[PDB]
Design a protein around this ligand. Sequence first.
Ligand SMILES: Nc1ncnc2c1ncn2[C@@H]1O[C@H](COP(=O)(O)OP(=O)(O)NP(=O)(O)O)[C@@H](O)[C@H]1O
Ligand SMILES: Nc1ncnc2c1ncn2[C@@H]1O[C@H](COP(=O)(O)OP(=O)(O)NP(=O)(O)O)[C@@H](O)[C@H]1O
Ligand SMILES: [Mg+2]
Ligand SMILES: [Mg+2]
Lengths: 373, 378
Amino acid sequence: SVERIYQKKTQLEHILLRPDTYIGSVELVTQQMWVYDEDVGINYREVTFVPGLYKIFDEILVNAADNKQRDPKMSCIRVTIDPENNLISIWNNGKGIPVVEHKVEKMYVPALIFGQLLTSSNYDDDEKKVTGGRNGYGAKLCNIFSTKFTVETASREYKKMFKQTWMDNMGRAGEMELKPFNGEDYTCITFQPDLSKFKMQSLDKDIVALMVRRAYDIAGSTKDVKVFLNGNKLPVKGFRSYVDMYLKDKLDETGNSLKVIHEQVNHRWEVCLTMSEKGFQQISFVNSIATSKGGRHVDYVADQIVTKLVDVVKKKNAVKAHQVKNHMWIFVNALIENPTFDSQTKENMTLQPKSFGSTCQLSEKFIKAAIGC
Amino acid sequence: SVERIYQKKTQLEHILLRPDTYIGSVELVTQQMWVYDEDVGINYREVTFVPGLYKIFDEILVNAADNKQRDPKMSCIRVTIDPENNLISIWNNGKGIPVVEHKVEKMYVPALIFGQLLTSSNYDDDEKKVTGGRNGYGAKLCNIFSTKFTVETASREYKKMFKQTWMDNMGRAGEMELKPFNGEDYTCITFQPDLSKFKMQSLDKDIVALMVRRAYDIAGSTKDVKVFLNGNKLPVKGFRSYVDMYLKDKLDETGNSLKVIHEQVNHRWEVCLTMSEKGFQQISFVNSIATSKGGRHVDYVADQIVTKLVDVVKKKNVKAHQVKNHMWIFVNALIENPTFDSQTKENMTLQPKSFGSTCQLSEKFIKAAIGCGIVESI
Ligand SMILES: Nc1ncnc2c1ncn2[C@@H]1O[C@H](COP(=O)(O)OP(=O)(O)NP(=O)(O)O)[C@@H](O)[C@H]1O
Ligand SMILES: Nc1ncnc2c1ncn2[C@@H]1O[C@H](COP(=O)(O)OP(=O)(O)NP(=O)(O)O)[C@@H](O)[C@H]1O
Ligand SMILES: [Mg+2]
Ligand SMILES: [Mg+2]
């Protein structure tokens, strides 16, 4: 019938029906990538996981990191991953969410921004923030892909603590709980991923290894934020220390230890460069988002290195750009104003350098070290 | 205030505020790419354009190509691009859209699927389809980024013709026009892009060259479909002839014409390979969509070539990326219910096991490839 063929879907139905552009694939994929295995540390290996599950975790984690920008006093992020009870919790301190009724939406702010699509504090680009949040989907996406999703946030400013639980893929909502509060602010998101939607039995070794490395990413990309994972503080202090976990004792194909060049250009840019034996490689972050596919921030840095190096071969000489890039392994941690991406998953940052809100001119010292690695 | 900080947006507001994940960047981009310049043909050069504009054109074009799968009797696609009057028209024959009132949505089907977000005939995946349409956004996105968007479609089956216009970024709709019909079905989408949304004054040389090459893509990726541009039939007949327009007079770094290996594995796969001297290059299509960032369909075909060529090299005295670095591959595939990273569909993510078909290059192809210059270069 005509009504069978031509269908209209609600926004909520569309997300569950076509998850890919929202949270990535909901099918099990087997591929190689960086993870953190216990008793091994950060290593590159083949893993079988569901991108979508890894992503709803990421959305909540990045939201926590975003609060450090909202309130620089924030100093900690506590993560809990419990396979047995299928429970994941992301806690952060610093200013909590305003526990008060939104005068326009007629409901308490936390319920609005965690229980309704297209809600955000990042819709006014005049503020030129360097938060990772941008579309107003992230948290609701995690909620929709969870069987139980709880939001607890305490606001001393408003003298109240808010707690409310959603269930059945954000299809049901429990009673909002309000209580007087006069303590240290905090926000804790606790959720039970709907494994049925990901066709999984439980949170296995592979997915956990991915989530743990992601926690290390956060500890390495943020500033003055201690990250705990199941009670254990992650031993990371600065982007440099994080990059070292990847290189530490790795040796060159000849035998010599890989040389690592580093420079924290300014308060918004930090770069590390080493030689690659498998073509161009990049590990990048924008506003604490893991830009796994890279983007303009990577090109911007990588290219000025390439140029310099090419301008050195012109002397000892017709080298192509890609030829030089193939021997490069670059790490970049940047803070970008109002970044744009190809999709909600934010794996590729597309904003033009002219609009970054800052520049990253590598030093002569860095270049000199680069021209001789 | 709390109300100023925490905001809720309607779906339509969100698209205009955050266009990127819907149609790509709305800012100018300068880079080299393949286009079609008149009196030159297909060529690779620096171009300055806005992806979002190029994309709304693409959405309507792929919709036309999709109809060939819906009605194999479809035979033509006619495209008109008039810079002067900022007008673009895309016409196709074959079955028209049912011109009847939708019993649930309370409006004629055409008005529903072109004027309401999240409307599609592709929401049921128990049906294994090879159309490019997937999310039910495409047509509405073009409407939204157009100052004027007209839909005309005729269905002999329902003995009716439908015509209606939308304006002001789908914010307003003119009266619906209905009339008796009993001729050859067709659908024509005519629109005037809202260039202000793309910070443009008019459809310049660069954007036109991209749109024209895109029309050539359609002529080369579809089967049994004649494509016309501004009244002229594009001289393409099969994916092979299409690829030849890129490799026509290309030469080696030494100066000899590059070797081109071709093969139509089956009714759903066609591959062309030659040598590259500027790193791995791929030009691919999935259900007539230009997968500019590639995807599993490209990995699938390229990886088996790499592994095999990687072997012939070992028995003659190597890594993987090193071999792939000298490959220029063209892939035209039909994939069942494909998934992509974004609405723009530049990267196809569906796993090979779910393609609905296989693509094993023949021995005649692998050997002919063994001597195109790749192995020798390594
Ligand atoms: N941990 C937190 N502490 C304080 N505020 C938070 C926290 N997490 C979320 N928020 C608020 O929650 C909102 C939730 O919206 P969310 O769905 O995550 O979209 P977003 O982060 O703004 N943009 P995006 O993630 O790109 O879709 C954010 O905009 C914040 O204002
Ligand atoms: N040229 C055409 N001929 C016949 N039917 C058409 C034509 N163009 C569009 N349609 C119908 O119009 C619908 C419009 O929805 P559209 O926005 O294009 O989404 P879609 O193509 O299904 N999916 P997508 O483009 O990935 O968002 C399609 O689903 C078709 O059923
Ligand atoms: Mg967020
Ligand atoms: Mg479409």
